[PDB]
Amino acid sequence: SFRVALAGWLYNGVVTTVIDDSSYPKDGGSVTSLENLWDFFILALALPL
Amino acid sequence: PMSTRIAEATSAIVSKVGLPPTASS
Amino acid sequence: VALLSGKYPPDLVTNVWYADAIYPMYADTEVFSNLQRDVITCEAVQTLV
Numbered sequence A: 001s002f003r004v005a006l007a008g009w010l011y012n013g014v015v016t017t018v019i020d021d022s023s024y025p026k027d028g029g030s031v032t033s034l035e036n037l038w039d040f041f042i043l044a045l046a047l048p049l
Numbered sequence B: 001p002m003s004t005r006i007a008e009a010t011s012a013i014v015s016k017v018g019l020p021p022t023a024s025s
Numbered sequence C: 001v002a003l004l005s006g007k008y009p010p011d012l013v014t015n016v017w018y019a020d021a022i023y024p025m026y027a028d029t030e031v032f033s034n035l036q037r038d039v040i041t042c043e044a045v046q047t048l049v
Helices: A001-009 A033-047 B004-011 C015-022 C030-048
Strands: none
Touching: none
């Protein structure tokens, strides 16, 4: 996924790269919970690439 | 050996996450 | 008895619970097919009269 994300910078107009549905929290996420905080962390570091 | 045969019994006795529950689970 | 005795799940969040529970029943088409049926019901009485 990392090298495909780096290779997708060249082909901007043909293909677009997004993060999967399954990488988000369950439904909402509820800051009360612990695992969804780390899910938010992983997502918010993955998104700018 | 008995060292494994006792450990299997301990694992048979002692057997079976922090998230909000859903109606599925 | 139902009024005097009612409890919750031990640590629930009332938006995660509903975003999980209400989701699977919103892929039905009977709520649209009854709207299709009411056309025939209303036009048949006008054709009769």
